[PDB]
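User: Show me an example of a complex going from sequences to C-alpha cells.

Assistant: Sure. Here are the input components:
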Amino acid sequence: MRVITLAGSPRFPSRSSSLLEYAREKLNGLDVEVYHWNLQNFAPEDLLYARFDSPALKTFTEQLQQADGLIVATPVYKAAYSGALKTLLDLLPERALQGKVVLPLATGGTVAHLLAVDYALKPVLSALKAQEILHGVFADDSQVIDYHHRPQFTPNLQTRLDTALETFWQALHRR
Amino acid sequence: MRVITLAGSPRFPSRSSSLLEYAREKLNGLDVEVYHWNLQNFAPEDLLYARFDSPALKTFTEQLQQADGLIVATPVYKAAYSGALKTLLDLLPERALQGKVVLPLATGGTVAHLLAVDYALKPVLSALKAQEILHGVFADDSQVIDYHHRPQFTPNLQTRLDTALETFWQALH
Amino acid sequence: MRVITLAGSPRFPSRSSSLLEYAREKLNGLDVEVYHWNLQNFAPEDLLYARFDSPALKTFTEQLQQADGLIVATPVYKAAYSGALKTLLDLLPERALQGKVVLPLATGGTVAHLLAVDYALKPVLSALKAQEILHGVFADDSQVIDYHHRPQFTPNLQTRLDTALETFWQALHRR
Amino acid sequence: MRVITLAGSPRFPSRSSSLLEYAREKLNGLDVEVYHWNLQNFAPEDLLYARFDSPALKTFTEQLQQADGLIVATPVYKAAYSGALKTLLDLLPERALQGKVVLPLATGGTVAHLLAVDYALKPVLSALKAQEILHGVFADDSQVIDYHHRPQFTPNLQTRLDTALETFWQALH
C-alpha cells in the first residue's frame, strides 16, 4: 500500500536514478502510495556531520516508518554503494527497515562490480533489520541506452526489472 | 507445501542442527511437509572433488526443485559459513533457489562473527538466485543450552527463532 | 617516509579519531612525514554532490599521491564504514592507493561488528588498488576508557595498536 | 625462505593451479624453497567432517608454520572461493597465517565474480591472522589459454601475475 523509493545517486540524472524511475512508473499505475526521496532532498551539512535533528530526516523517517516497502537504488562507486547514500542510511534509526520488504537496484561502469549489491548494499539494509530482501537488479552501464528523458533499457534489463517489481508487489501484501 | 532444512555442520548433531530440528518441529505443527538433509547424506569424495553424478546430489536436487522454501543452518568458521556446506552449495544448479524463500540460520563461538551471515552466507544464497532472503538468526554457542537430545535455547534465542519462523511461514503464503 | 592519516568519523572527538591520534603520536616520534586529514577539512557540498573540482580534494590527493602509506580510521555505522568516509573515498582517483601500504583501524558499539573491517572497509581500499593491506585493528567501545583528552586504552588495545604500527612502519620501507 | 602454494580447486589440474605452477616457476628462479599442496593431498572424509587428526593436516600445518609466505588460488564458485578449499582453511589453527605474507589468486567463468576475491577470500585469510594480504589477481577463464600441460596466459594476465609476484617477492624481504 505504501512504498518509499530512494535514489542514492549523488548526481541527477543518473543511470541508477532512472532504474528507480521506471519502477516508480510501473508502480504508480497501481495507485500504490509512493514517496520518492533522493539525496537532493537533504542538506549536505546534516548528512556529513551526522546531525540527527535534520528536518528532512524527520519527514523521511516518518514516511519510512509508514511504508510497507522500500525500493532503493545506487551507483556502484569503489566496489560498494555510494557513500552519499550511506550517510543517510547512517542516520536512520537502528531498526528502521523492520517489518518491510526491500528491493535493491544498482548500476555500475562494469559488470565486474555486480557483486557490490550482495556484499555491500544488502548487509547494510539487513543491519537496518529488513524483514526480507529481494534478489534485486544490477545493470552495467551498457544495458542503459538512454537515461536522460525516457529510460531506455535493453529488453533483458527491462525484463529483469519487471520480474523484480512483480515479486516486490506480491511480497508487499502478504497476510 | 514443502520445506527443505539443510544442516551445514560437519559433525552431527550440532548447535546449528538443533535449530533446524526446532524449526522442523514448529513447521510440522502447521502441516508443512519437511525434508531434512545434512552433509552426512553425501559421499565426502563427491563433495570435495565436485562430482555431479553423486546419487545423493541428484535426489537432493529433485527434492529442492519441488520445494517452496529452504531453512539452511551452519556454524561460523573463519568468519564465514562452513566449507563443508559450501562444497554442497557449489554443486547445485545455477538457479537452484529461484522462486524460493530462504531462511538463513547460524551459530558461532563468538558474537564477533555475527556478520558472517549477512556478509558471507547470504551472498552465496543469492548467487543461487533465492527469490527472497529473510533476516535470519545468529546464535552464539552459549545461547544453545542442549543440542544433543532435545533442542533447548535461552528465552531470547527461542523468541528470535520463533519470530523468524513465523515470518518464514507467512512468506510461504 | 611519508604517511597520510585519515580520520573517517563524522564527529570530533570520536572513539575512532583517537585510535588515529595514538598512532600519529607514536609515529611522529620517528620524524616520519605525517599528514593528518579528517572530514572536517572538506566542504559537505563537495562530498555529497560528488564535485571533483574540490580544492580540498586536490590538496589531499596531491599529498596522498606522495605518501608511502595510509592509516585510515572509521566508526562502524550500520555494519560498515561511515558513509561520510566513503563520500571522500568515492572522489579519489581509480588507482589512488597503488604502491601504498595501508593500515585500517575501526571502533564500534559492539564486538558484533568486528567483521565490518574485513568485509566492508578493506574491499574499498582494495578497489583503490592498495598494494598491501594490513590485518588492522578493531576495538569495541569498551576498550576505550577515555578518548576526550589523552587516549586511554586497555593494555590489550594498546598492545594490538603497537603490534600493527610496528608492522606498518616496517612495510613502509621495503626495497 | 619458504613459500607454500595451495591449490583450492577440486579438480587437478585447473586454471587456478596453472597460476600457482607459473608462480612456482618464477619463485624457484629466485632461490625460494617452494612447497606445493592441493586438496588431493587430503582424505576427503577428513576435510568434510573436520577431522583434526588428519595426518596430512598435521604435515601441512608444520610446513605452513615454518613458511614465510603463502600463495593460495581458487576458482570462484557461487560468488566466493570453493567450499573445497574452505574445508581445509577451516581446519587450520586460529593464528595459522600470523607473521605471513599472503598472495591471493583466483579464476572465474565470468568477470561478474571478480569481487569474490576481496569480499570473500580475503576476509577468511584475515581471520587466520595474515600479517598482510597483497592486492591479488583475478583471471577470468578466458585469460587462461592452457592449464593442462604448460601454463599459458594472455599477455595482460601474464603481466598482472608478474607484477603481483614481484610485490610478493619484495615483501618476503
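The lines above are the inputs; the final block is the predicted structure for all four components together. Chain B has one domain: 1-173.
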